[PDB]
Amino acid sequence: GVARCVARRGVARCVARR
């Protein structure tokens, strides 16, 4: 449920984790 945007080598990856 937690939409987390993580910067992965410049790329902004928004993934929902629980």
Q: What one-letter code names the amino acid at 4?
A: R
C-alpha R_g of the chain: 8
Q: What one-letter code names the amino acid at 18?
A: R
- Cβ atoms of 1 and 15 closer than 8 Å: no
Structure tokens at 12: 């902004």
First to last CA, the chain: 4
Structure tokens at 7: 């910067």
Helix (H) or strand (E) holding 9: none
The C-alpha angle 3, 13, 16, rounded to 5 degrees, equals: 25
Structure tokens at 18: 């629980």
